Design a protein around this ligand. Structure first.
Ligand SMILES: OC[C@H]1O[C@@H](O)[C@H](O)[C@@H](O)[C@H]1O
Ligand SMILES: OC[C@H]1O[C@@H](O)[C@H](O)[C@@H](O)[C@H]1O
Ligand SMILES: OC[C@H]1O[C@@H](O)[C@H](O)[C@@H](O)[C@H]1O
Ligand SMILES: OC[C@H]1O[C@@H](O)[C@H](O)[C@@H](O)[C@H]1O
Ligand SMILES: OC[C@H]1O[C@@H](O)[C@H](O)[C@@H](O)[C@H]1O
Lengths: 103, 188, 45, 103, 103, 103, 103
């Protein structure tokens, strides 16, 4: 399997690593129909989303999407720094595929 | 040094619980960001308040022994019938004042360790009540102290403290070692 | 020179907000409640 | 997808943004039949609910109703300031569609 | 929908409000068969239970029963003050219908 | 229906109440096949397990087993003191049926 | 049942005990298709993964994989020292089978 976020991110098409190394500035969570999602922003201006579950997601991802939204909530609340993000860059806002934290 | 630090203070346990810990002057809740506070080590080490062991300019001063803190409290909180001596664990929010300010240390002989931003309540091991200047030596332990977390932590190294020393822009300290190698922009 | 002093200010505040994050990781984590993801999803998506 | 809570809130009828900028004053949780809901209030006296799941909810919203209840509980407990609420205002008390908070 | 715990409690028969205004003194949890439940006790001597799921519970109540026990475990562990309880009084110990927390 | 852990522990055969009055010394968690369990120990030397779900558990207990393993992970991490354990003494290590915490 | 992680670990082919006695240095979580996994590293350079659910996992392990990821995320955030890991070494990075922590 991959050993680092950078190794996992380049086996996918349309991805890229953003090195953030900062805490989340804002967290938005929606339960509105068809927009059940989380949006996060950084001081630097980047906006990223966890996508609404949909046809493009395999069954194993539907479970990992809910885990990701839980990680982002408690990461935001405790102000833990995110080190890097791997995002699919063909979505607006760009879409989170993987996160790492360090220290 | 032994892992506990000491501070005589007239503010009682449940108020400290409401403030979220031992706060510097003019800061009311530990996590409050809107009450923007001046934080400067140099100005903190040089200041004196009446009825408070040094707690201005963003730091809260502590001592290395129960005896020093008691001496401090007797000189400063003397009129009070009851004051407390809080027992605090070492952690990297604490800086050794004589080590960071070096020869420019204002009051070397006191050997203060100062907490940047105050001391969170979970960092307070317990307290002793002092009544009419006499320490009741039965320690009351703090139920919310994080034993496992604070267990093995230490003071911040002086290194980390040099760029936060706070000397004025004209102070020759910014022109000599070791501060020169850590001077913030516009200092020197 | 203001720049010295507001730099001092700004670096001390950074240092403080980062120590406040270590404390929040300690006290806020006692409120974290875990979700059974399989039964949450077990109705759809 | 929308990038802010204001943009998201605008996609729906009968919604409104509230600028709160305060922590929750009280949290009520109920497991009584047909009132399985959460109510939160602010010092201002504004009161909001997470609705009971009903016919007006599509399937994808049911796991998001659960997540929103989890987010309000931990936001109350930690005394985290809420920035804005997107609510449906044809409901009494008004119901949360989305929440945002800023550090 | 009800705006307070007093108002919600009143829509049910055999309910009563207890103003607690205190932390839980003890938490008991069982996974013994037919006794999958929680019991909490306060200084004042009052004892309350979250009931075992059974025939009295309509299916919307089942996720809510699990939430109430997650909330009580967190409240106990962190010594969070409970303000009022709405309980059914035709059960021994009385069953928690709803809980409110303030500040 | 029970008022206390000792009244509850009384309803089952092969149980015992252990008064621990201490926090957990160690926590082991396993995801190995047929060994999906949690093992806790105390400074006094006692070792307890939450058993793997087998044939002896009825279905109501399936959720209860997961909650108990959740309680034991967070009791360990908050260094919370355990008062009593009701255990099945016909299993090695003895098997936890209920826990009591106080204060 | 086993009483220690070393007992339990010695019941499997391709396992090995590592004594870490340290806190997690970095935590990586992925929701990318077929790599829905958690990867952790320690200061001494060791990397371990919780692997993706697969045909090698029996049904009782499916909920145990998810509890292991919840444990790693919460002990990464609390900087809790991990005492030992039992890992399958026929996987790269080594795959976590069990974890123990003590103070
Ligand atoms: O797995 C989720 C991903 O699926 C891809 O098919 C899509 O191009 C990405 O934008 C993202 O949605
Ligand atoms: O999806 C939830 C929402 O559905 C709408 O149709 C309804 O008018 C709102 O009040 C709210 O219940
Ligand atoms: O919904 C749960 C409640 O259901 C009622 O039928 C019963 O009288 C209450 O005591 C309680 O069990
Ligand atoms: O519910 C679990 C319990 O079931 C009993 O019948 C068994 O004798 C106990 O050892 C325990 O497994
Ligand atoms: O069930 C989990 C384990 O299954 C084994 O068969 C495999 O060899 C291990 O590497 C691990 O995947």
């Amino acid at each position: 399997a991959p050993q680092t976020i950078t190794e996992l991110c380049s086996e996918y098409r349309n991805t890229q690593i953003y090195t953030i190394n900062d805490k989340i500035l804002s967290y938005t969570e929606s339960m509105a129909g068809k927009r059940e999602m989380v949006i996060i922003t950084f001081k630097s201006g980047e906006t990223f989303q966890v996508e609404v579950p949909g046809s493009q997601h395999i069954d194993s991802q539907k479970k990992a999407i809910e885990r990701m939204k839980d990680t982002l909530r408690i990461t935001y609340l405790t102000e833990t720094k995110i080190d890097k993000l791997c995002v699919w860059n063909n979505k607006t806002p760009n879409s989170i595929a993987a996160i790492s934290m360090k220290n | 040094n032994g892992d506990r630090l000491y501070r005589a203070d007239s503010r009682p346990p449940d108020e400290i619980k409401r403030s979220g810990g031992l706060m510097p002057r003019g800061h009311n809740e530990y996590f409050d960001r809107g009450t923007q506070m001046n934080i400067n080590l140099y100005d903190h080490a040089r200041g004196t308040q009446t009825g408070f062991v040094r707690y201005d300019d963003g730091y809260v001063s502590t001592s290395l022994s129960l005896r020093s803190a008691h001496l401090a409290g007797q000189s400063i909180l003397s009129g009070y019938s009851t004051y407390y001596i809080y027992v605090i664990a070492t952690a990297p929010n604490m800086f050794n004042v004589n080590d960071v300010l070096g020869v420019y240390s204002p009051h070397p002989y006191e050997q203060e360790v100062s907490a940047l931003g105050g001391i969170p309540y979970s960092q307070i091991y317990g307290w002793y009540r002092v009544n009419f200047g006499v320490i009741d030596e039965r320690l009351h332990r703090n139920r919310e102290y994080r034993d496992r977390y604070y267990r093995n932590l230490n003071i911040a190294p002086a290194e980390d403290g040099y760029r936060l020393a706070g000397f004025p822009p004209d102070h020759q300290a910014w022109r000599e070692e070791p501060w020169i190698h850590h001077a913030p922009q516009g200092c020197g | 020179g203001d720049t010295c002093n507001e730099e001092t200010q700004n670096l001390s505040t950074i240092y403080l907000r980062e120590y406040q994050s270590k404390v929040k990781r300690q006290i806020f984590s006692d409120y974290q409640s875990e979700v059974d993801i399989y039964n949450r999803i077990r109705d759809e998506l």
